[PDB]
Structure formats: structure tokens, C-alpha cells
């Protein structure tokens, strides 16, 4: 389909001469020839397809590519890269616009900036647009992705927008759906620039000419504007958020920075200084300029002199480029600087991308929940003076629990959750019916309990059904609160009356039924009757292991339920151990008392109902169960024989000591 939807073009007519008869304006030789402005290019179906998976210097990764026209639909490439490239839509976006020519940097600055960029690509899962051909900024970011991203999750999804004629070995890239190898033999005299081999994806922006730049620039701009138009599923801001990293560069870097700052939506630009050229003059125009035009004459003249001399630029247009620099200084909110001197540039690019987004603070929190970054969220989104709307933080908690985010719910209970007011019957049922997380087996259990009581795929599971699920799993005579007549009449009357006064216990049953062990430990950490909750969670884990052994499917679920069961059992063991070390008089009273939220049972009877081994073998239960044998009596010293003599001789009972009531 890809050949019949994307079309190439090639210069096949006119053939002028530009200071040489063989040197065409289309770039190829006169004998080599076989936009349409003075070139007369002919549109045709594309022949360049397949994979250019590389050899040499490592980097033998999957490197499929596509060649399109310079005037092609951004949407058609969008459906291409979403459908048959196996690339899901990213949660962020970063570009590698910079110096096209080859340069070099200091080792520490290169290492820190590269590590920051690659771990930003790891945390946000973004798409990285790069020039593609390994020279200058592209070569530096290729060494950067090869620095530690090859040692940490090497699926980076880097896309290289390169011209079709500027790449070396164009005849090697001919062939449709053919895996053509390309060697990294860098010719020092060839004008056709070598490729960056450890890039995973390639774009061959074909303008019908060879060895000319600027054609891929317009295609890259329309593709990134279309990518920002595509709304993300969380719908935080204006589609996928985008940000542009600039290292070195020329006047083109200044012009595209001024284009980015004045663009709709306002895409921010990260600028990294210490590298020279356009990035340093943007940094100098950002550091001492304040509100755009608040620049004194001395530093303005010094910047003009450094443009005229260090940048080797004309002094007549130096005033024009200072006007462009002041235009870049007019939108300093989007402009970011990274003056360095663990603790990489990930936080800087994260607060840069979340700063200039024209988005609300719940939108930034949803974006941070997408990126799975809690430190950046704590540093930027949760700050002083933040006017959080009512209901949005509850929605943030709902999104955080359904995506199974332990540090985000730690931050959310640290920032005023009010968990008693947050939890209701309807929110709990929507929490249960949500399936936007890991795999689970609620459906088979609810089908089994519906078959036992007496199932559509669109069936909404009620709280009565899951309450009878805990009744089935715990077994015996366990009576969950969800089958109570009072809760049934409240459910009939409604489908802090709907609120739960004891929320952490429903958090225990939701955590154990959704296979979320991290949720189970975290909601253990706060709450009352924690021994009872850990014990009954062990009971549900052992019962789910019994169901997943009596069904014995793909055994990862059965082994993790056995793991969670014996782990929660030894959790009960060690908490009883600690309460024995603290004091014994509260310890046996803890093990005896009645549990109003757990079917009016005790620790010991729910323990043997759970069939846990090592809970009742500790010395606390030893003296408890020994003293619950003697009853109200002290006749024990060499027992066995003395109790036989009492029950045979009613006179001899009077010579036995009695415990004081």
C-alpha cells in the first residue's frame, strides 16, 4: 500500500549548467540524469522501500525507511507511522535542530547533555526528529544515544529527516521491500553525507534533486505541526506536546527558533549553551535581556560585534539578526537555558516542556502521569500559589489508581487527597470496572459466582457481585459487608451516605482483586486494623491461588498469587513478632478482639480460615491458647495427672489454686 500511496520524483528534463556543463541545477551529472521550478521533475511511484539494517561498529538494528515527496500529506505519513511502522503515539516530542556542519564539544558537557536527552527519551517515550546523516549535531546525538541509551532500553524511536539526494549510496537504496545493507565506510571526499547507523527510523524527503538542503525542513515543520494537531488520549493540551533542542546552529537556527516561539501552539525551545554559535547567542540574548527590549547599549553592541566577528557575519544584516534576536527575546517564557555547573538535563527539559504549554495544572499533572515522572511533577506542577479546581484532583486520583501509579498516589495523598470524601460507591464501581491496567481475572471469577448463584462481555459488575466474590473466596461462614441488607438497601436507594468511613479496607479488596500488590502494600501503610487487613488479603491471595491452581492456566498468575499469599502471610508473622517485642498485654488483646468490618470474626479464626502456617506458632498465641485451655483456673504444675485427680476426686478440686476474677 505504501508504494501506491507515497510518490517520489526526479529531475529528468531542462538540464541547465551552473559553472560546469556536467553540474546540473538538479545536482546529478548530465550523464547521470535520465521542485518543478527550472528542473521539470516528474512524479512517479516510489521505488525506495524496505530496511537498511546496518553492519559495522555494532548498531545492527531494524532500520526500515520510507521515501516520500517534499510536497506530501503530513496526515498520510501520520497514518503510515501509526499503522504499519508499529509505532504508538508518543507522550512528548523533541527535535535535534542544530548545526548541520561537523563540530566537536567538551567531553563533560557532551556527556551530561547526551545523558539528559536520552533519559528524557526513556521517561517520556518521545519521538526524536534528527537530521539523520551523521555529522555535527546528528553525530553528537548518535554518540549520545550510543552513550547510555544502548545500555538502558534501546527502543528510542529516532526518526531522521534527510534529503534523498544528500544521503550516500542512493543506488544501494533502490529496491522495493528489499533489505539492502549499507556499510559505514565513511568516504572523506564524497559530498554525499554518511548516515547515522544506530537510528531506528529514516525518512528520505525527496525533492527530485541531489545534494541540496532545505527541502526536508518544510516537510519536518508540517509533520511536527500535524503531530501536535493529533490529540492525545488523555487530552491534556494541544495534542502531543512538542519542544525543540538547539545545539550550535547558524542563522537558520535563529529563524526556526523565532518561528517556534511565534507558532500556534507555542512550542518551547530548549537552548543549551557552552557549545558556541547560534545557541550561545540565543543564550546571551536570553540571560541579560529581561522583557525582550530591556537590553543596555553595551551588551547589545558586544552582541553585534560578536555576530559580526565570531559568527563571521555581515555587519549590514547584523542589525537584522539583532532584530530577530530581540524577537526571540520577546517570548522568553518558551525560551529555556541549560547552564550546567544523576542530576541530568531531564528535569530541565521536563519543566521546559511543561512550562510553555498553555495548559492547566491538572493537564500538566495528566501529562506527568503519562510520562511516569513524579519528581518533575513535584518540582513543577505541585508548587505554591497553585489554584487547583475542585474535582480535578479527584479525577487525577482516579486516573492515578487506574494506571497503577504508586508514587503519584503518594504525591496525591501528600497534597490533600481527603480519601474519605473521595471514595463513594459509584467511583469505587467505576474503579473496579476500569480495565486500563495490567491483566487480571475478575471476569472468570464473576462468571463463576454468577453460575454458582444461578455472562455478557459488557456486563457492569456490581458491588454485590464482588462482595459475594470475597464470600466465595474466603469461604466458610464469611459474610462480607457488600451482602448486608443495609448496603443492599443503600444500593437500591442510590442506583456521607454514599461515602465509606473505612476506605482502606475496600482499597485492600480492590488491590487484591486487581492483582496490584504495590497498591496492596501502599494502602496497608496507612489505615486501621492493619493486622486484620494483611491477614484477610493473605486469605484472598491464597484463595485466588486456589482458583488459579484449580483452573491452572498460564502459570505466571498462579505463581505470583502463591508469592503474594506467602509474602502476606510472613507479613502477618513479622507484625505479630514486632507486637510481641513491644508489649504482650496489648498483643493478646490485639489477637483476640472482634472485627466489625470482617464478619465479626477474630485474628485466629480468620487465620485458620486462611490456612496460614506460621501465624499461630508464635509465643503470643502460645500463651493465649494455653491460657484459653486452663479457663478461670490455676492448676497446672505438672498437669495431666493433677487434672485427672481432680475429676476423679471432687474433694481434691478444693486444694487447687484459682485465678482471681
Amino acid at each position: 500500500w505504501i508504494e501506491r500511496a507515497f510518490y517520489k520524483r526526479e529531475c529528468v528534463h531542462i538540464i541547465p549548467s551552473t559553472k560546469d556543463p556536467h553540474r546540473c541545477c538538479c545536482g546529478r551529472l548530465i550523464g547521470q540524469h535520465v521542485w518543478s521550478i527550472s528542473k521539470h521533475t516528474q512524479l512517479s511511484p516510489t521505488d525506495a522501500f524496505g530496511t537498511i539494517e546496518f553492519q559495522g561498529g555494532g548498531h545492527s538494528n531494524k532500520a526500515m525507511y520510507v521515501r516520500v515527496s517534499f510536497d506530501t500529506k503530513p496526515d498520510l505519513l501520520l497514518h503510515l507511522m501509526t499503522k504499519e511502522w508499529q509505532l504508538e503515539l508518543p507522550k512528548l516530542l523533541i527535535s535535534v535542530h542544530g548545526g548541520l556542519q561537523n563540530f566537536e564539544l567538551q567531553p563533560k558537557l557532551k556527556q551530561v547533555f547526551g545523558k539528559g536527552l536520552i533519559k528524557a527519551a526513556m521517561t517520556t517515550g518521545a519521538w526524536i526528529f534528527t537530521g539523520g546523516v551523521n555529522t555535527g549535531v546528528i553525530r553528537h546525538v548518535g554518540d549520545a544515544l550510543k552513550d547510555h541509551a544502548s545500555k538502558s532500553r534501546g527502543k528510542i524511536c529516532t526518526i531522521g529527516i534527510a534529503p534523498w539526494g544528500i544521503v550516500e549510496n542512493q543506488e544501494d537504496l533502490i529496491g522495493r521491500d528489499v533489505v539492502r545493507p549499507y556499510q559505514t565506510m565513511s568516504n572523506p571526499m564524497s559530498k554525499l553525507t554518511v548516515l547515522n547507523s544506530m537510528h531506528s527510523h529514516f525518512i528520505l524527503a525527496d525533492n527530485g534533486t541531489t545534494g541540496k538542503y532545505g527541502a526536508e525542513v518544510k516537510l519536518r515543520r508540517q509533520l511536527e505541526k500535524h503531530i501536535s494537531l493529533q490529540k492525545i488520549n488523555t487530552r491534556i493540551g494541544q495534542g502531543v506536546p512538542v519542544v525543540a533542542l538547539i545545539v550550535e546552529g547558524g542563522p537558520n537556527v535563529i529563524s526556526i527558533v523565532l518561528e517556534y516561539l511565534r507558532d500556534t501552539p507555542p512550542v518551547p525551545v530548549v537552548v543549551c549553551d557552552g557549545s558556541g554559535r547560534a545557541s550561545d547567542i540565543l543564550a546571551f540574548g536570553h540571560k541579560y535581556s529581561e522583557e525582550g527590549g530591556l537590553i543596555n547599549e553595551s551588551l547589545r553592541d558586544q552582541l553585534l560585534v560578536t555576530i559580526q566577528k565570531t559568527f563571521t557575519y555581515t555587519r549590514t544584516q547584523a542589525q537584522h539578526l539583532f532584530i530577530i534576536l530581540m524577537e526571540c527575546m520577546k517570548k522568553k517564557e518558551l525560551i529555556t537555558v541549560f547552564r550546567m555547573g544523576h542530576q541530568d538535563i531531564d528535569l530541565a527539559i521536563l519543566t521546559a516542556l511543561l512550562k510553555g504549554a498553555n495548559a492547566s495544572a491538572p493537564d500538566q499533572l495528566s501529562l506527568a502521569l503519562a510520562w511516569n515522572r513524579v519528581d518533575i511533577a513535584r518540582s513543577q506542577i505541585f508548587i505554591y500559589g497553585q489554584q487547583w479546581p475542585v474535582g480535578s484532583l479527584e479525577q487525577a486520583m482516579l486516573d492515578a489508581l487506574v494506571l497503577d501509579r504508586v508514587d503519584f498516589v503518594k504525591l496525591l495523598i501528600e497534597n490533600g487527597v481527603s480519601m474519605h470524601r473521595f471514595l463513594t460507591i459509584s467511583r469505587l464501581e467505576e474503579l473496579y470496572n476500569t480495565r486500563h491496567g495490567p491483566s487480571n481475572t475478575l471476569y472468570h471469577l464473576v462468571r463463576d459466582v454468577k453460575k454458582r448463584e444461578y455472562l455478557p462481555p459488557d456486563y457492569r459488575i456490581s458491588l454485590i457481585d464482588i462482595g459475594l466474590v470475597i464470600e466465595y473466596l474466603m469461604g466458610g461462614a464469611y459474610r462480607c459487608n457488600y451482602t448486608r441488607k443495609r448496603f443492599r438497601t443503600l444500593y437500591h436507594n442510590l442506583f456521607e451516605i454514599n461515602h465509606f468511613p473505612f476506605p482502606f479496607h475496600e482499597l485492600m479488596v480492590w488491590a487484591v482483586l486487581m492483582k496490584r500488590q504495590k497498591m496492596a502494600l501502599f494502602f496497608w501503610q496507612h489505615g486501621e486494623e492493619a493486622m486484620a487487613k494483611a491477614l484477610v488479603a493473605c486469605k484472598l491471595c491464597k484463595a485466588m491461588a486456589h482458583e488459579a491452581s484449580e483452573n491452572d492456566m498460564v502459570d505466571d498468575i498462579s505463581q505470583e498469587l502463591n508469592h503474594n499469599s506467602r509474602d502476606f502471610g510472613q507479613l502477618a508473622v513479622e507484625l505479630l513478632d514486632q507486637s510481641y517485642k513491644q508489649d504482650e498485654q496489648l498483643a493478646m488483646k490485639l489477637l483476640t478482639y472482634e472485627l466489625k468490618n470482617w464478619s465479626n470474626a477474630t485474628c485466629l479464626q480468620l487465620a485458620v480460615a486462611a490456612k496460614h502456617r506460621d501465624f499461630i506458632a508464635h509465643t503470643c498465641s502460645q500463651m493465649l491458647l494455653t491460657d484459653m485451655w486452663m479457663g478461670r483456673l490455676r492448676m497446672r504444675k505438672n498437669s495431666g495427672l493433677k487434672v485427672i485427680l481432680g475429676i476423679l476426686l471432687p474433694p481434691s478440686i478444693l486444694s487447687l489454686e484459682f485465678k482471681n476474677k
Binding site: 489505615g527 486494623e529 493486622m531 514486632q578 513491644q582 490485639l590 483476640t592 472482634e594 465479626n600 477474630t602
Partner: protein, 123 residues
């Protein structure tokens, strides 16, 4: 045999929970105890491990429970940080921090001593 004394503690619990519910007369003379249990049940209806904890003593056993929860995770963090594993999971990062910090001092102290020699020459 590593669990022989331990497994006796499970089966002795089943004996204790049964004998609490058994009527006091022997299973020979349990017609007498059944007669008086029907006697006490009908005289009121027609006319051990489950103590009822009141509303003020549930509070003093609940706060013992959450103070146990916060205090126990202190001990597992202290044995983790003082173990042979995690205590050297911190020392190598600190020594690596002195790798380029002291080398940064070594790079610029050559210029600092040369600045002292140059100033002393021009004085």
C-alpha cells in the same frame, strides 16, 4: 522433622476451639447438659475468643497498631542500610563522586599555583 513441633501447634488449636463449645457434662451424661441448655434457652426466648471491645478501648488498641506499622518499617530500613549489600550500594557512588570532584581540584590548582608564581615574579 524441621516442622514437627510446629505442626503440633496447628492441630492443638482445633482441640481448643472445639472444647470451648462442648457442653460441660460428658458425652455419656450429655442428656443432662442438653436438658439444661434447652432449659436456659427456652426460659429466655419464650419469656472466650470474642470479647466485646467498647468504643473507648478500641481506640487505645488501634493506635498501638499504627504505631507498630510506622515503627516496624524503621527496623527493615535499618537492617537494609546496615547490611553488607546496601551499605556498599552507597559507598561506590560517593567514591565515584570524589573521582571527578578531586580531579577538578587537580585541574585548576595547577593554574592556581602557576598564578601564584606569576604574581610573585611580577612583584
Amino acid at each position: 522433622k524441621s516442622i514437627s513441633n510446629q505442626v503440633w501447634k496447628f492441630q492443638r488449636y482445633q482441640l481448643i476451639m472445639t472444647f470451648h463449645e462442648r457442653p460441660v457434662l460428658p458425652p455419656p451424661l450429655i442428656i443432662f447438659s442438653h436438658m439444661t441448655m434447652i432449659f436456659q434457652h427456652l426460659c429466655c426466648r419464650w419469656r472466650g475468643l470474642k470479647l466485646f471491645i467498647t468504643d473507648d478501648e478500641l481506640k487505645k488498641v488501634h493506635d498501638f497498631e499504627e504505631q507498630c506499622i510506622e515503627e516496624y518499617f524503621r527496623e527493615k530500613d535499618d537492617r537494609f542500610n546496615s547490611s553488607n549489600d546496601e551499605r556498599i550500594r552507597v559507598t561506590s557512588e560517593r567514591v565515584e563522586n570524589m573521582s571527578m570532584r578531586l580531579e577538578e581540584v587537580n585541574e585548576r590548582e595547577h593554574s592556581m599555583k602557576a598564578s601564584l608564581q606569576t604574581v610573585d615574579i611580577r612583584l
